């Protein structure tokens, strides 16, 4: 059924699974019109489909042209997400297809179930976890490829860089969610923490800087300090 803290280790077992987050699929700016009305302008978006065990990220870029002439875009965005996830699963070899797809928002359940009718053995599940995947667009190289796209495009990343050479997928996922939670709560300060030392650089083929084990402990501590600092500023604590 739903996925929560009680079955958290299930994420890192050997059954292929994907998280699907649709937050960044339909993105708009809201502005006044010359006549003093309000209008939206869409910008490029993305589906965030992630294997939490391997770090493989299937980033489908949603180009603004897919919205042209369409109505009820927030509803259509869920069905377009489900369409694209279904197409991804069909494109994968059988032995690579997931056994479960976990959606981060419950409104994706029916659209994805209907698009996956042909896959009765793939479980579509919600989660009680509050996962910060909306912050994916705070990762500079992911934001860059989304905004520069001129047509629909799929780009593949490993969101863990080379961390699994040294840590488990449980620890890698925890690091990821802490980094994304910090970028979601205070993006400027989080990026400041990440690029504070010029000596540590982001490899051309990576998303995050090349921290040693000891530096990652320091970084993780500063991210937690950031989240607690913001929690205190928020609630006056």
């Amino acid at each position: 059924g739903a996925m929560n803290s009680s079955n958290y280790a299930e994420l890192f077992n050997n059954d292929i699974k994907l998280f699907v987050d649709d937050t960044n699929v339909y993105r708009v700016t809201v502005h006044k019109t010359f006549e003093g009305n309000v209008a939206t302008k869409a910008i490029n978006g993305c589906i965030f489909t992630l294997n939490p065990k391997t770090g493989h990220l299937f980033l489908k870029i949603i180009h603004t042209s897919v919205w042209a002439g369409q109505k009820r875009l927030s509803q259509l965005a869920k069905w377009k997400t489900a369409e694209e996830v279904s197409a991804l699963v069909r494109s994968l070899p059988k032995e690579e297809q997931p056994k479960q797809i976990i959606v981060t928002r419950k409104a994706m359940l029916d659209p994805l179930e209907v698009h996956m009718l042909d896959f009765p053995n793939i479980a579509i599940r919600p989660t009680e976890l509050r996962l910060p995947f909306s912050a994916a667009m705070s990762i500079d190289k992911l934001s860059d490829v989304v905004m520069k796209a001129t047509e629909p495009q799929m780009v593949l990343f490993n969101i863990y860089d080379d961390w699994l050479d040294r840590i488990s997928s449980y620890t890698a996922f925890s690091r990821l969610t802490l980094l994304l939670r910090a970028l979601k709560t205070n993006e400027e300060s989080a990026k400041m923490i990440l690029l504070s030392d010029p000596t540590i650089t982001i490899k051309s083929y990576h998303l995050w800087p090349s921290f040693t084990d000891e530096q990652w402990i320091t970084i993780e501590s500063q991210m937690r300090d950031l989240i607690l600092t913001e929690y205190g500023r928020k609630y006056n604590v």
């Binding site: 259509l76 069905w79 369409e83 029916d110 659209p111 179930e113 209907v114 698009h115 009718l117 042909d118």
Partner: protein, 300 residues
């Protein structure tokens, strides 16, 4: 007018005949029901006084044979049987009629209720939902499951309603996922009406039969079916105009007849609020919306 005579009433029982009911005492000199209107299906149903478990009954049509009830003390129920000797059947009934041992079907002349509840119900369609081919009448009870219920267990004793499932390949054309899930017109008009039922009269017949089994037996899978068939129409943007007008009449008389005190168990809040207030056809059920609002405003 036709007659369902009873050999005896050895156990105390509440007898229903269509929407009417009356109590018979243990060993009371009761020998059946006369003046049953020809031209409609009917249902004669039972609830034992000493064990309200298992409401059960028989759907029949007096144009199809001579049927009577005799208690079976082995299986512990009132059974319908067919008398093929017509001369014998007439004499046993005339004797019962002369000794005034029968109740009269108490139809008021003004009263079209039973016609309005059974307008599209035919015996031949009942006999395909309830498969027991050696009898001309059909047994239904409180506990019989539906084929769809059994899929989610004795198939010989099931209610073979048409399976409706909004998240199934039957309901959803590949490539029209969003379209077909948000607008059920394809599923309603092509799969169900053109494909399975052949016409709206057969669709309404099954709908009306499902309601009646829900109301008279408390059959839960029948209530599920009734609501599903309502929702499938209301959730379709394209429905023939005569179908919506007829649906409003059908539903109005069902809601009018429902016992007020069974509303909590026989009515699905989600379906009705969706159908009356959110669906494509939210404005097409004026009569049903008015009686629902005046009679069951809590549900809404």
């Amino acid at each position: 007018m036709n007659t369902v005579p009873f050999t005896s009433a050895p156990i105390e029982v509440t007898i229903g005949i269509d929407q009417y009911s009356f109590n018979v005492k243990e060993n009371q000199p009761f020998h059946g029901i006369k003046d049953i209107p020809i031209g409609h299906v009917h249902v004669i149903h039972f609830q034992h006084a000493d064990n309200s478990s298992m409401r059960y009954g028989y759907w029949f049509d007096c144009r199809m044979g001579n049927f009577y009830i005799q208690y079976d003390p082995k299986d512990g129920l009132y059974k319908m049987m067919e008398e093929r000797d017509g001369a014998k059947f007439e004499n046993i009934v005339h004797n019962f009629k002369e000794r005034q041992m029968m109740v009269s079907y108490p139809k008021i002349d003004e009263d079209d209720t039973w016609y309005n509840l059974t307008e599209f119900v035919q015996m031949d369609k009942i006999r395909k939902i309830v498969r027991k081919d050696e009898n001309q009448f059909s047994y239904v009870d409180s506990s019989m499951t539906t084929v769809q219920e059994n899929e989610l267990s004795d198939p010989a004793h099931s209610l073979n309603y048409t399976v409706i499932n909004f998240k199934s390949r039957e309901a959803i054309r590949p490539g029209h996922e969003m379209e077909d899930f948000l607008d059920k017109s394809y599923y309603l008009n092509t799969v169900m009406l053109q494909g399975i039922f052949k016409n709206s009269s057969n669709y309404f017949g099954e709908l009306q039969f499902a309601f009646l089994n829900a109301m008279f037996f408390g059959n839960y899978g029948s209530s599920l079916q009734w609501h599903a068939m309502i929702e499938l129409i209301c959730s379709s943007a394209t429905v023939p105009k005569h179908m919506l007008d007829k649906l409003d009449e059908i539903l109005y008389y069902q809601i009018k007849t429902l016992p007020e005190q069974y509303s909590d168990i026989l009515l699905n809040e989600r379906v009705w609020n969706i159908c009356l207030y959110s669906s494509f056809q939210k404005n097409s059920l004026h009569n049903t919306e008015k009686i629902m609002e005046n009679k069951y405003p809590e549900l809404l």
